[PDB]
Amino acid sequence: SNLSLITKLSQEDGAILFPEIDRYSDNKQIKALTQQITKVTVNGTVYKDLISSVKDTNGWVSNMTGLHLGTKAFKDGENTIVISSKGFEDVTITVTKKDGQIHFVSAKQKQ
What we know:
Blueprint: E1 10-12, E2 15-18, H1 28-35, E3 37-42, E4 45-49, E5 59-63, E6 66-70, E7 77-85, E8 91-98, E9 101-108
Parallel strand pairs: 4-5
Antiparallel strand pairs: 1-2, 2-6, 3-4, 3-7, 5-6, 7-8, 8-9
Organism: Streptococcus pyogenes serotype M1
Binding site for heme: 23-24, 64
Subcellular location: Cell membrane
């Protein structure tokens, strides 16, 4: 099923940002989900939560601007990001990479 509250990303140096995955969100479900993130994987590679920038890392940070993800595990074509949390079913975000640009495709909680 769709998680159409997550609809966009911003591309940064060696990182991407999902501004809607916000721990201070007005949407109570998104806020709880973001606060309760337990695991992040990109193409099956486990990312670590960083005490920091995420540039060129297998790392993530959730802060005021959203969820920041390093692009170290990204590849050309389809990329799958899986965000697990304590209270919500896994969120799968699909993005495509082409010519060094990363495009948002979809955010879902897959069956």
